[PDB]
């Protein structure tokens, strides 16, 4: 019986496709995202 | 299954299983809410709340109270809609979208009114 | 038997009430401690930010850690969650914000590369069959600068390694890195205002007497940037711990 | 002590907890071993 | 006199007036006096900071991750970590020096320099 | 209000609100300590302690126990006194000044006595 | 103590105290889980579960219902075994090793059959 059980397990088609041998949440607005900036005390180039 | 078919029986039994699991968690939820439940339990709780809302229906005799006309849902449509609910194909809509409606057309329309999409 | 069951349930509820009240008071004290730690950390943040400002004002802002990459394809998201679980919607809110960030990255043709802090997010993402590159746990209640340093080192190493990566190839480095770094964490604005927020830490945008820089402004800037990133990670960890409490 | 036994405490509360434990141990008594009033007074002291 | 402020990431360490601030920047040893020019420098991997007031014993601090910022009004040492001579235990400073890891060996060397062993 | 009027009702409800807030804060005070409390919480705690001590009175039946004879406080005097207390008009007086006295005159006598 | 001796009485009273504490903590464990208990209470809960299982025994008259032959345990062996249990000696063994066995030799045998070593 144990040998028969193992032989059967050799080719048992599990539900999830694994042998038994042995969303897309809501997007985010960039404006919500906060950017880490570097302060520069000079006129813009 | 011998009388209502295998599909009807399977869908009904899955609905009952989900609702029973929801009722079993009511003790934990009453004290702590769904936040302490596992991911599987959280998903089942959301599914069960949507299912329990969807079992409600705007009845024909309820028009005298609410002023809204009632609706009729074919049996096949009911089985299919609750099959989708159990699978989780409406897990993204708000709960209120399932309250006091008929079939899936009404669900889509109410979801659109509430800002969701089906 | 109904009355006996009701008496047992009353006893159970009373014990639960006592434990929850003790936890609430302990959490009040913990909030006090976390706020104290955040205020203690603030001065170093201010000083290092000032020094970085000064170095930038007298240096060439061409650091590889400072310039938007071309055809970017990967982002490194650091989700910061708790280890314990009795917080109400802390982890849930953090993870909803992280999901929103993932959707935003998808709309921009980026594949999130996930880094997690705390076990609760680990469970959430394991349930969702999402790969977690690296996770750090056990210190969410009281993070120190060592943990922030390690997290920043890992994140910056991955980001730089992403420089040579081309397409799905890892470039000359051999390591497939990321083109951005994001931190999702709970900011503690008030005793009621705790908000999950996403923040791009890398690359850094530029915002607009003479100091004597030695050996040269560029070397000082290069040494200061990683420490600035580590400081910001540490600040995020402290504020997330306060929000959790 | 009964209020505090649910328990990160100030000095007074921790001292109250210790004193309560000591007093609870004090009122324990073996069977068939009554104490004269003076011995009880000394023990409570 | 100048306002010395030894400040770490996790907290502030020490603050007060001083007459002399000796340390070892990457370029070389530097001694800061009350009216030194504004300066920004990186302390060496195993830098040690000696602070001398008016008639008080010097504070010798072993600093890891140090950055020196001198201004006409104040002088600051922003350290990733820093430990004073009194708290520094000689055994650890000796044993952790010259270890496999460069960072730990540098930290041990800084502790030894603070003690005086170098 | 339809029975005792608006002033009495307002003063009584204010006293009840203050005492209820103090009862809420009592566990924090007992377990973590007063110092931890915020400044507004400490102000409310001082006011509530003063109010609760002033609710005590020297009783006619207490003469046999303590030499101090009892006092009869008119209702309107009580209402105005507790309005003043809820307005924080006696926060600066020592707590022991409010124990086992009558009306405002007694409160004065006991305050300038200390 | 007068009839059964000091050791027997002390061991029995300690067992009863542990089991009473476990009964007290049952509800908290069920609702809030185990991690919310203090380390001391976690240790006590593990000890109590093992003690509760060890108080079970494979009785002779019960063989017909389990197929497992019954066992007998001398009083001295019982006292010594439960004194060891209340002291946390067998905390490394799985709690399942203590289920339906006799003396300490049975405990070692069953733990070995489960991998653990007494």
From Swiss-Prot, chain C:
Major localization class: membrane
Record's keyword terms, sorted: ATP synthesis, Cell membrane, CF(1), Hydrogen ion transport, Ion transport, Membrane, Transport
GO molecular function: ATP binding; proton-transporting ATP synthase activity, rotational mechanism
Membrane topology type: Peripheral membrane protein
Biological processes, Gene Ontology terms: proton motive force-driven plasma membrane ATP synthesis
Location(s), subcellular: Cell membrane
Example of a GO cellular component annotation carried by this entry: plasma membrane
Family of the protein in this entry: Belongs to the ATPase gamma chain family.
Subunit composition and interactions: F-type ATPases have 2 components, CF(1) - the catalytic core - and CF(0) - the membrane proton channel. CF(1) has five subunits: alpha(3), beta(3), gamma(1), delta(1), epsilon(1). CF(0) has three main subunits: a, b and c.
Function per UniProt: Produces ATP from ADP in the presence of a proton gradient across the membrane. The gamma chain is believed to be important in regulating ATPase activity and the flow of protons through the CF(0) complex.
Name of the molecule in the record: ATP synthase gamma chain
Record organism: Mycolicibacterium smegmatis (strain ATCC 700084 / mc(2)155)
Swiss-Prot record, chain D:
Disulfide bonds: none
Location of the protein in the cell: Cell membrane
Family according to the record: Belongs to the ATPase alpha/beta chains family.
Subunit structure: F-type ATPases have 2 components, CF(1) - the catalytic core - and CF(0) - the membrane proton channel. CF(1) has five subunits: alpha(3), beta(3), gamma(1), delta(1), epsilon(1). CF(0) has three main subunits: a(1), b(2) and c(9-12). The alpha and beta chains form an alternating ring which encloses part of the gamma chain. CF(1) is attached to CF(0) by a central stalk formed by the gamma and epsilon chains, while a peripheral stalk is formed by the delta and b chains.
Entry function: Produces ATP from ADP in the presence of a proton gradient across the membrane. The alpha chain is a regulatory subunit.
Protein known as: ATP synthase subunit alpha
Species in which this protein is naturally found: Mycolicibacterium smegmatis (strain ATCC 700084 / mc(2)155)
Biological classification of the source: Bacteria, Bacillati, Actinomycetota, Actinomycetes, Mycobacteriales
Name of the encoding gene: atpA
UniProtKB/Swiss-Prot annotation, chain E:
Gene Ontology cellular-component annotations: plasma membrane; proton-transporting ATP synthase complex
Record flagged with keyword Transmembrane helix: no
Disulfide bond positions: none
Topology class, membrane: Peripheral membrane protein
Location (main, coarse): membrane
Location of this chain's protein in the cell: Cell membrane
Keywords tagged on the record: ATP synthesis, Cell membrane, CF(1), Hydrogen ion transport, Ion transport, Membrane, Transport
MF annotations from Gene Ontology: ATP binding; proton-transporting ATP synthase activity, rotational mechanism
Annotated InterPro entries: ATP_synth_F1_dsu/esu, ATP_synth_F1_dsu/esu_N, ATPsynth_dsu/esu_N
Matching Gene3D superfamilies: F0F1 ATP synthase delta/epsilon subunit, N-terminal (2.60.15.10)
Database matches in NCBIfam families: ATP_synt_epsi (TIGR01216), PRK13442.1 (NF009977)
Function statement: Produces ATP from ADP in the presence of a proton gradient across the membrane.
HAMAP family to which the protein is assigned, alphabetical: ATP_synth_epsil_bac (MF_00530)
Assembly: F-type ATPases have 2 components, CF(1) - the catalytic core - and CF(0) - the membrane proton channel. CF(1) has five subunits: alpha(3), beta(3), gamma(1), delta(1), epsilon(1). CF(0) has three main subunits: a, b and c.
Homology family: Belongs to the ATPase epsilon chain family.
PANTHER family to which the protein is assigned, alphabetical: ATP SYNTHASE DELTA/EPSILON CHAIN, ATP SYNTHASE EPSILON CHAIN, CHLOROPLASTIC
Name listed for the protein in its UniProt record: ATP synthase epsilon chain
Organism of this sequence: Mycolicibacterium smegmatis (strain ATCC 700084 / mc(2)155)
Source lineage: Bacteria, Bacillati, Actinomycetota, Actinomycetes, Mycobacteriales
Gene that produces this protein: atpC
From Swiss-Prot, chain F:
Coiled-coil stretches: none
Subcellular location(s) per record: Cell membrane
Family classification: Belongs to the ATPase alpha/beta chains family.
Subunit structure: F-type ATPases have 2 components, CF(1) - the catalytic core - and CF(0) - the membrane proton channel. CF(1) has five subunits: alpha(3), beta(3), gamma(1), delta(1), epsilon(1). CF(0) has three main subunits: a(1), b(2) and c(9-12). The alpha and beta chains form an alternating ring which encloses part of the gamma chain. CF(1) is attached to CF(0) by a central stalk formed by the gamma and epsilon chains, while a peripheral stalk is formed by the delta and b chains.
Task of the protein: Produces ATP from ADP in the presence of a proton gradient across the membrane. The catalytic sites are hosted primarily by the beta subunits.
Protein name: ATP synthase subunit beta
Organism (species): Mycolicibacterium smegmatis (strain ATCC 700084 / mc(2)155) (Mycobacterium smegmatis)
Gene: atpD
């Amino acid at each position: 019986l144990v040998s028969v059980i193992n032989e059967f397990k050799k080719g048992f088609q599990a539900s999830d496709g694994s042998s038994v041998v042995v969303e897309n949440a809501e997007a985010l607005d960039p404006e919500d995202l906060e950017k880490e900036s570097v302060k520069v005390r000079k006129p813009a180039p | 299954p011998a009388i209502v078919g295998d599909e009807h029986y399977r869908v009904a039994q899955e609905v009952i299983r989900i609702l029973q699991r929801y009722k079993d968690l009511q003790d934990i939820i009453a004290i702590l809410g769904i936040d302490e439940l596992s991911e599987e339990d959280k998903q089942l709780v959301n599914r069960a709340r949507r299912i329990e809302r969807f079992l409600s229906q705007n009845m024909m005799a309820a028009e005298q109270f609410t002023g809204q006309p009632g609706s009729t849902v074919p049996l096949k449509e009911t089985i299919e809609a609750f099959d989708k609910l159990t699978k989780g194909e409406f897990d993204h809509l708000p709960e209120q979208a399932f309250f006091l409606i008929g079939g899936l057309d009404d669900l889509a329309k109410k979801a659109e009114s509430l800002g969701a999409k089906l | 038997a109904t009355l006996r069951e009701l008496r047992g349930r009353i006893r159970s509820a009373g014990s639960i009430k006592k434990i929850t009240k003790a936890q609430e008071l302990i959490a009040t004290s913990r909030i006090a401690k976390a706020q104290a730690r955040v205020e203690a950390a603030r001065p170093y943040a201010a000083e290092i930010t000032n020094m970085l400002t000064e170095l930038a004002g007298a240096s060439a802002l061409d650091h590889p850690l400072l310039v938007e990459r071309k055809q970017p394809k990967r982002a490194g998201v650091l989700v910061v969650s708790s280890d314990r679980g009795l917080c109400g919607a802390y982890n849930a809110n953090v993870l909803r914000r992280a999901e929103e960030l993932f959707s935003l990255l998808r709309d921009e043709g980026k594949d999130p590369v996930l880094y997690v802090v705390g076990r609760k997010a680990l469970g959430y993402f394991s349930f969702r069959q999402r790969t977690v590159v690296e996770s750090w746990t056990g210190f969410s209640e009281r993070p120190t600068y060592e943990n922030a340093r390690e997290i920043a080192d890992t994140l910056v190493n991955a980001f730089m390694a992403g420089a040579d990566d081309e397409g799905d190839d890892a470039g000359a480095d051999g390591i497939l890195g990321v083109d951005e770094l994001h931190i999702v964490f709970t900011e503690f604005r008030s005793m009621l205002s705790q908000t999950a927020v996403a923040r791009r830490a890398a690359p850094m945008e530029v915002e607009y007497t003479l100091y004597s820089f030695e050996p040269d402004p560029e070397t000082l800037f290069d040494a200061l940037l990683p420490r600035y990133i580590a400081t910001r990670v540490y600040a995020a960890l402290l504020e997330a711990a306060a929000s959790e409490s | 002590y009964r209020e505090l036994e649910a328990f990160d405490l100030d000095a007074a509360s921790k001292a109250q907890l210790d004193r309560g434990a000591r007093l609870v141990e004090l009122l324990k008594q073996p069977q068939y071993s009554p104490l004269a009033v003076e011995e009880q007074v000394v023990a409570i002291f | 006199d100048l306002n010395v402020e030894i400040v770490a990431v996790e907290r502030e360490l020490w603050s007060g007036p001083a007459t002399f601030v000796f340390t070892r920047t990457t370029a070389g040893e530097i001694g800061i006096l009350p009216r030194h020019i504004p300066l920004v420098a990186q302390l060496v991997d195993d830098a040690m900071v000696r602070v001398e007031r008016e008639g008080e014993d010097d504070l010798r601090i072993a600093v890891d991750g140090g950055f020196l910022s001198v201004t006409e009004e104040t002088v600051r040492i922003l350290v990733e970590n820093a430990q004073f001579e009194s708290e520094i235990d000689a055994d650890a400073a000796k044993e952790d020096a010259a270890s496999d890891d460069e960072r730990t060996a540098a930290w041990g060397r800084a502790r030894l320099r603070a003690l005086g062993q170098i």
